[PDB]
């Protein structure tokens, strides 16, 4: 994995030694070169994971998250270069440094062979995210949002530290490859109950779990566009990655510990989606949609059937692409009206037709239109949870109604109807913005041709 | 003060601490503490205002009371052991009195009640000495008497120091009291891992001294003693805001920084000894310390508070202050976690 | 640096260079007392170094190329706009007054640095001990607020206590009418707008507040407008003083060492001019502060430390 | 009154001074070369050669082999009269059971 970590670190001299007008073009070019290089991780086998060293390996779960992560950096650089154009050159280089450093932490978070190194990188991802939100966020509430984002994650994860060090003392190792073969069944006790909670609640917060999700409609909304892209597209999916790693060590206790949390998700996706029907802030509507979509990933990991893991990792990759594009579309209208009120700018298909078509495609992938990998993940999770209990389809199916309802209302409020009269600074769509939308949507639609690469280690 | 007299007085402070470190007799331990206090009193009264004299009076009373309890513990040790070796203590009453005396010298709760006062009353350099160098000699004696330290006593002092030093700094706008309550919390962290593995005690002491010296050196470089005066730094010295950012994110124990290193290792030596509740509660209580560190970083680095007009004059004068070891300490207090297995040099 | 504690250890004492001619002499008077030549005349008869009166661009004159910067980088204020509109909206009055107090504090630090490093006395014009005599003259004219007076008293309370008074105060008795006649013969189109009550309040805070409180800590010499014309009488009066008051008597090598370590660190001298008291006439918001700071960094010879700016022709930087 | 503050800077239009703006930069040469870099190393390189690379992955997670191997094994055990799959994954001759 050292053929990826070293170019990501060489992106630091590539942004701090660049000419003052070349610091976006060079970082975009070489980050796209790293993203083209990321395809070598697709050397996956049906039996063995691509095991590099004592420190790094990459199975078919971590590989699509890595390719999405290394792809997301050029898209964040294209997204965040317009509103940081009047910024000081040193703070501009510091912003690019925080994005590069966050990618650097993420690519060795997903390839951590050992779990306490996973913890160190997993909590290392807080600090560039916290600095990006609380420094380049636009409104007043970025400080409070950074506080909530920091202290939900740390309060969930400092018991995870004690739990992982307890596994290191008990089993002898926190290598995942060793613990595939030295896993002991976890019996029923209160000690093993709080063992389970300490191993799970950090990732429950990072997914987020319903009831614990209060950081997210502040952290995703008060962030800048690159912060919202990396928080929605990757940093939620650390929780699903970590749960899929750590429920190896939590059997058969998960079979009766998952019962409340599944309820919290199966009801939570009914609530948060319903919250999306009454959100006046468009960016908050996309945030609660992200909560509603990650509730299915929580359910699928907690029922721990193969169809559920295949659908959950397909839903993670698909929601990363779709939610990143929806935040970028909301930014494309925020850079024209300078407000996030959804009812303010209306009728935008009369003025911006191709950008309305990008809104249309992002809304159709949001509502899981087949054969998108959104629908492949959604459908496979629904199959596995019908196998879990035959009544859950009601909570699934009603969700698939409400998920349609706000996905098109967002399309009807913003793009359709009569245009707002007094708003006259609606510029034509830049080539940069349509490039951003196309680089989100075209990989998402190409993955419908060959979806087996985003279906996880048990395809 | 005469600089020759200042050099002799600082060498006498260092001499008293070294005499505590290198001696095998209890009378020489007591003599080292007496010499250390007697020499550090003028460092506190350097600027000659009533706050320094009040702070020196409070420091004298607490350290004199601790020295008397120390000599009483030594005398009871001579009763019940007939000898004077600096080693384990041969009476639980002498062990209790010496643990109380060293807790009073460190400022561990509920004997913490002099640390935010005195550090407020004295200059930043003398507070640097008080919070870094004056923690060395009682932790050396606690290193050498740990076969007789009562477990419930040292753990009560440790958790009470961590909780009280956590809830202290949340109400604080004065930077020296923030460093004082941070001192109380970190001394609780040092003494909690004491009876389990004193190498991690030494690691926590060294990393804390590095980070505290970095923060006091930044405070002396920017000449700021309040939060609201530290908030003027971005308009004067923008690099110093980045330095206080990374050092305060280090002091909260946030990975991938070096200040995550001690407490993690402390947990790494307490879950081996089947203590799971206690390092969990300690780690959750450290979030309070991290909260007021985040408050300081919000005021200084991550936002821009309004400055005044006269700051435009200070744009025309570079810093002529001897910021000794500030790049070295700033690098060591942030980027040392990949060198975590270096701790075996303290074994 | 050059001077420090090590030079005080290695024998660089300051009472060895302290001679009888080493006197810090402040000349004071009204806006047209004519003292501006008189001070210079004292400097050419006692062999002292003359510092001109601190204006907006004193710090510009002492740093960099020594040339005045644009006013948005230094001052952010105008004396002429104060003469035109003393009761203005934006608060030029106390902003100008606080900038002039900081500039005079820099001048007084330069004066003590020259006196304590060279043993040469310095003749000053309207030092920091006679700056409030304009301030109250503004506040008695309603030009500034009571909060501005409180901000000035806080900054003065934490800055003037670190210093010594001058040796000699030279005051010049000029009445208000002669001041106005010299202003009208001066021809300055903004200075002619100065009223009578303002000059009268300047004279009242001179005679009632300044000179009595300086009568203890130093030796005042008061002259009319015509007997300050003859410089040699004032020089003979200074040469035959019996310096027996003030805290200049108990100044040994250690105390003057501490004072010299103070006055050579200009950021330590100028530390408490910008105390975080959010007064609207002096508070600058973050966007304007950032904009003017980044524009000041773009100026030549101002981006780095002084011996490190390649664009103004610094060499050997890769070995510095 | 309140402090000395710069007023709100107005929103700039890139299409005024650069009517051929792609939106990457206000300098037109930097803007057009940023467009060329984004479109070449985004679409011509990563998307096109990425789809070619994923299209021709060498038997991704050995599924094709697994069909062909199954086509061997069925062909062995149709003719030899064996059942197509045993319900025992491992040989019961090499499993000891806890006696009761």
């Amino acid at each position: 994995m050292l053929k990826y970590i070293i170019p990501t670190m060489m992106l630091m001299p590539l942004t701090w030694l660049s000419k003052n007008s070349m610091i976006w073009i060079n970082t975009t070019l070489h980050s796209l070169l790293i993203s083209l290089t990321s395809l070598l991780l697709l050397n996956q086998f049906g039996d063995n994971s691509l095991n590099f060293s004592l420190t790094f390996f990459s199975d078919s779960l971590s590989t699509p998250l890595l390719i999405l992560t290394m792809w997301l950096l050029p898209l964040m650089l294209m997204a965040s270069q317009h509103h940081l154009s009047k910024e000081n050159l040193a703070r501009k280089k510091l912003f690019i440094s925080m994005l590069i450093l966050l990618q650097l932490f993420l690519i060795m978070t997903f390839t951590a062979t050992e779990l306490i190194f996973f913890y160190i990188m997993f909590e290392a991802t807080l600090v560039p995210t916290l600095i990006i939100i609380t420094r380049w966020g636009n409104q007043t509430e970025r400080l409070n949002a950074g506080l909530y984002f920091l202290f939900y994650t740390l309060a969930g994860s400092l018991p995870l530290l004690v739990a992982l060090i307890y596994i290191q003392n008990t089993m002898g190792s926190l290598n995942f490859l060793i613990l595939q073969y030295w896993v002991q069944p976890m019996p029923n006790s209160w000690s093993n109950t709080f063992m389970w909670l300490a191993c799970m609640m950090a990732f429950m917060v990072k997914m987020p779990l319903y009831g614990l999700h209060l950081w997210l409609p502040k952290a995703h909304v008060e962030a800048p566009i690159a912060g919202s892209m990396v928080l929605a597209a990757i940093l939620l999916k650390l929780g699903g990655y970590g749960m899929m790693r750590i429920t190896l060590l939590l059997n058969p206790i998960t079979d009766f510990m998952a019962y409340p949390f599944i309820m919290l998700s199966l009801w939570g996706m009914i609530m948060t989606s319903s919250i999306c029907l009454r959100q006046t802030d468009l960016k908050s509507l996309i945030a609660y949609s992200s909560v509603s979509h990650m509730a299915l990933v929580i359910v699928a990991i907690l029922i721990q059937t193969p169809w559920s893991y295949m659908g959950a990792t397909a839903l993670m990759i698909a929601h990363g692409l779709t939610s990143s594009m929806l935040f970028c579309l909301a930014n494309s209208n925020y850079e024209r009206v300078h407000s996030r009120t959804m009812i303010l700018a209306r009728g935008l298909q009369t003025l911006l037709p191709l950008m309305a078509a990008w809104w249309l495609l992002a809304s159709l992938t949001n509502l899981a239109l087949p054969p998108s990998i959104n629908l492949i993940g959604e459908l496979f999770v629904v199959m596995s949870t019908f196998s879990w209990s035959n009544i859950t389809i009601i909570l699934m199916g009603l969700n698939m109604v409400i998920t349609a309802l706000y996905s098109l209302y967002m399309l009807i409020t913003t793009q359709r109807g009569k245009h707002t009269h007094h708003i006259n600074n609606i510029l034509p769509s830049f080539t940069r913005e349509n490039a951003l939308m196309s680089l989100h949507m075209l990989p998402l639609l190409l993955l419908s041709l060959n979806p087996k690469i985003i279906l996880g280690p048990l395809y | 003060m005469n600089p020759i007299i200042l050099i002799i007085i600082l060498m006498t402070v260092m001499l008293g601490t070294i005499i505590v470190m290198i001696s095998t007799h209890w009378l020489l331990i007591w003599i080292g503490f007496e010499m250390n206090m007697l020499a550090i009193i003028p460092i506190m009264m350097k600027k000659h205002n009533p706050r320094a004299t009040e702070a020196s009076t409070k420091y004298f009373l607490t350290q004199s009371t601790a020295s008397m309890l120390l000599m009483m513990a030594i005398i009871i040790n001579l009763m019940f052991s007939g000898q004077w070796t600096v080693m384990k203590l041969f009476n639980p009453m002498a062990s209790m009195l010496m643990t109380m005396a060293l807790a009073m010298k460190l400022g561990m709760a509920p004997f913490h009640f002099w640390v935010p006062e005195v550090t407020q009353g004295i200059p930043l350099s003398s507070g640097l000495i008080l919070l870094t160098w004056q923690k060395l000699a009682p932790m050396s004696v606690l290193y050498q008497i740990l076969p007789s330290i009562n477990l419930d006593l040292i753990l009560t002092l440790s958790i009470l120091s961590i909780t009280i030093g956590g809830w202290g700094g949340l109400n604080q706008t004065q930077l020296r009291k923030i460093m004082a309550y941070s001192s109380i919390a970190h001394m609780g962290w040092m003494t909690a891992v004491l009876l389990y593995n004193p190498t991690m005690t030494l690691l926590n002491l060294i990393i804390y001294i590095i980070m505290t010296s970095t923060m006091f050196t930044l405070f002396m470089a920017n000449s700021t003693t309040t939060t609201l005066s530290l908030s003027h730094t971005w308009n004067k010295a923008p690099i110093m805001t980045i330095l206080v950012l990374i050092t305060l994110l280090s002091m909260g124990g946030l990975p991938p920084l070096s200040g995550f290193m001690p407490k993690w290792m402390i947990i790494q030596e307490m879950t081996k000894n089947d203590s799971i509740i206690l390092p969990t509660l300690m780690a959750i209580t450290a979030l309070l310390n991290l909260y007021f560190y985040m408050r300081l970083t919000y005021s200084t680095a991550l936002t821009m508070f309004p400055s005044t007009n006269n700051m435009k004059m200070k744009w025309q004068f570079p810093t002529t202050k001897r910021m000794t070891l500030l790049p070295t300490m700033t690098v060591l207090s942030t980027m040392l976690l990949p060198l975590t297995p270096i701790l075996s040099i303290l074994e | 640096l050059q001077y420090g504690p090590l030079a005080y250890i290695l024998g660089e004492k300051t009472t060895k260079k302290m001679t009888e001619n080493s006197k810090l002499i402040t000349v004071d008077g009204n806006i047209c007392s004519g003292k501006s030549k008189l001070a210079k005349e004292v400097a050419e008869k006692l062999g002292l170094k003359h510092f001109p009166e601190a204006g907006i661009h004193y710090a510009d004159s002492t740093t960099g190329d020594g040339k005045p910067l644009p006013v948005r980088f230094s001052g952010n204020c105008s004396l002429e706009k104060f003469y035109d509109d003393p009761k203005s909206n934006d608060g030029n009055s106390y902003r100008l007054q606080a900038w002039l107090y900081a500039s005079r504090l820099l001048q007084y630090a330069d004066a003590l640095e020259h006196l304590l490093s060279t043993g040469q006395g310095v003749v000053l014009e309207r030092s920091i001990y006679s700056d409030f005599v304009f301030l109250e003259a503004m506040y008695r004219q309603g030009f500034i607020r009571k909060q501005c007076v409180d901000h000035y008293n806080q900054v003065k309370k934490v800055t003037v206590c670190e210093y010594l008074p001058p040796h000699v105060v030279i005051y010049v008795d000029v009445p208000v009418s002669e001041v106005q006649s010299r202003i009208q013969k001066k021809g300055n189109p903004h200075e002619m707008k100065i009223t009578s009550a303002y000059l009268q309040d300047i004279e009242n805070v001179y005679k009632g507040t300044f000179l009595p409180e300086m009568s203890e800590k130093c030796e005042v010499l008061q002259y009319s407008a015509w007997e300050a014309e003859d410089a040699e009488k004032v020089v003979e009066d200074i040469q035959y003083l019996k310096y027996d008051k003030g805290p200049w008597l108990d100044q040994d090598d250690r105390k003057l060492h501490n004072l010299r370590m103070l006055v050579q660190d200009k950021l330590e001298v100028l530390n408490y001019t910008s105390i975080p008291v959010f007064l609207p006439e002096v508070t600058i918001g973050a966007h304007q502060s950032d904009r003017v700071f980044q524009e000041f960094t773009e100026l030549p010879g101002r981006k780095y430390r002084a011996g490190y700016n390649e664009d103004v022709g610094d060499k050997w930087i890769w070995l510095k | 009154l309140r402090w000395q503050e710069d007023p709100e800077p107005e929103d700039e239009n890139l299409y005024e001074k650069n009517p051929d703006s792609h939106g990457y930069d206000k300098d037109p040469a930097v803007d057009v070369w940023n467009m060329r870099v984004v479109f070449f190393f985004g679409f011509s390189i990563v998307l096109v050669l990425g789809s070619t690379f994923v299209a021709y992955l060498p038997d991704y997670r050995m599924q094709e082999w697994a069909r062909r191997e199954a086509e061997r094994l069925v062909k062995y055990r149709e003719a030899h009269g064996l059942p197509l799959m045993e319900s025992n994954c491992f040989d019961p001759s090499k499993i000891q059971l806890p006696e009761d």
């Binding site: 380049w136 966020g137 636009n138 409104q139 007043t140 970025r142 300078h338 | 949340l170 109400n171 604080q172 706008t173 309040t226 939060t227 609201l228 908030s231 005021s299 936002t303 821009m304 508070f305 309004p306 | 975080p276 959010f278 609207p280 508070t283 918001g285 973050a286 966007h287 | 309140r2 402090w3 709100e8 800077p9 929103d11």
Partner: peptide, 19 residues
């Protein structure tokens, strides 16, 4: 439309004797 930076009202909350 620019980035929010703290005003005098935000800054005076950090300038008391206690928090």
């Amino acid at each position: 439309a620019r980035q929010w930076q703290p005003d005098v009202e935000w800054a005076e909350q950090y300038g008391g004797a206690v928090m």
